């Protein structure tokens, strides 16, 4: 399935005034479901880092960064999350995917599963594609062996939806009820 997060770049600034005729221009990378959420995260970061509020600012650009061609790659994601018991916790993890958005979505699902952390308590610090010889975890490194092969066992194959049945003859493909 296609990843549920998209890669946004937001460019913004503070509205000019007499005090600051020529304000600075800031660029921001985010992974959000849509551009409204992307703008919300951008303004939150601006408020908590540069003391600039959305009611006194301008958004000059909000665009989507297109993904590269699909190739099996190793992605390093530097991420952090908050919890009441332990404050802020930062970690660095490695995933295998075909795109940066896919890797980040996988990281979000993994954090939700293994630490019960939700979207709005998570900040993504960095994501990059790294070479095979720089991979440190064996669970990731095992997948770039030159002679990797394995069988498919314990499969559950369901029939095509139009052909599914309820009662079927014992050693026969004949359907009895539907």
């Amino acid at each position: 399935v296609k990843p549920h997060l998209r890669h946004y770049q937001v460019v913004g600034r503070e509205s000019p005034s007499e005090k600051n005729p020529e304000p600075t221009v800031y660029k921001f990378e985010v992974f959000a479901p849509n551009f409204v959420v992307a703008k919300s995260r951008f303004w939150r970061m601006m408020r908590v880092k540069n003391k600039v509020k959305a009611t006194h600012g301008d958004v000059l650009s909000c665009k989507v960064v297109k993904d590269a061609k699909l190739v099996a790659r190793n992605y390093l994601v530097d991420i952090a999350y908050y919890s009441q018991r332990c404050g802020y916790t930062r970690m660095v993890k490695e995933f295998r995917d075909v795109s940066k958005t896919g890797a980040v979505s996988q990281a979000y699902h993994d954090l939700a599963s293994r630490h019960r952390a939700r979207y709005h308590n998570i900040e993504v610090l960095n994501v990059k594609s790294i070479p095979d010889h720089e991979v440190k975890h064996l669970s990731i490194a095992q997948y770039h062996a030159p002679n990797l092969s394995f069988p498919l066992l314990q499969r559950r194959t369901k029939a095509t939806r139009k052909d599914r049945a309820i009662f079927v003859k014992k050693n026969t493909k004949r359907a009895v009820v539907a």
Partner: protein, 220 residues
């Protein structure tokens, strides 16, 4: 047993032997709850269903755990007068019937008719052996429902250890049935081979364009 009035009416009308449409289900290696749910829905839709080999159903978990669950169920009892209290059945077929009954509106006439449309057996009785091919429920089979690493129980052993008294009898009857069926199937192999050979040979005698149509549709 039919009444003499019914027999006389049948003789007067002059009708042949009648059997209603009945679906026979082999319940070996099936998941108890999922099989019960499917059967209950079909009964409410209005089918007639007969289930066999109820002693080889499966429940996830360990035999000790499921035996303890059954003992906890057996503890329930009306203190004032147990003759009016819950009735705990020990046979696997009765266990399956009770499980199905719990998934029906049993306190309405519609629910009671649906329940009475069901017949359950242990093993395969002679009156059911020769009635036609049996069916299975693909979405309730163990080899697609359970992960193979986990333990499971067989209903017959649990029933035998909680009070069922006919496991050995059922086993002997099943062994005799399998031996008899194996002998009969070892016979008639010549008939099957002859029919297959005749079907193979008929192609050389049938018309060529019919052969071509069969090849085009993949039945050649």
């Amino acid at each position: 047993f039919p009444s003499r009035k019914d027999a006389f009416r049948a003789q007067r009308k002059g009708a042949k032997k009648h059997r209603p449409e009945i679906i026979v289900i082999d319940l070996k290696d099936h998941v108890l709850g999922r099989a019960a749910a499917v059967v209950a829905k079909q009964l409410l839709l209005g089918k007639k269903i007969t289930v066999v080999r109820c002693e080889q159903l499966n429940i996830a978990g360990t035999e000790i755990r499921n035996k303890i669950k059954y003992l906890q169920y057996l503890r329930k009892r009306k203190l004032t007068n147990p003759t009016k209290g819950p009735f705990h059945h020990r046979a696997p077929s009765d266990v399956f019937v009770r499980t199905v009954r719990s998934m029906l509106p049993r306190y309405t006439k519609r629910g009671m008719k649906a329940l009475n449309s069901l017949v359950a057996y242990e093993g395969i009785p002679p009156n059911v052996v020769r009635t036609g091919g049996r069916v299975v429920i693909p979405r309730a089979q163990r080899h697609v429902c359970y992960r193979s690493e986990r333990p499971y129980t067989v209903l017959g052993n649990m029933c035998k250890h909680v009070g069922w008294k006919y496991s050995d009898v059922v086993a002997n009857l099943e062994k005799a049935r399998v031996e008899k069926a194996s002998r009969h199937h070892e016979k008639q192999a010549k008939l099957r081979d002859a029919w297959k050979s005749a079907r193979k040979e008929a192609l050389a005698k049938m018309p060529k364009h019919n052969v071509e149509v069969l090849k085009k549709f993949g039945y050649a």
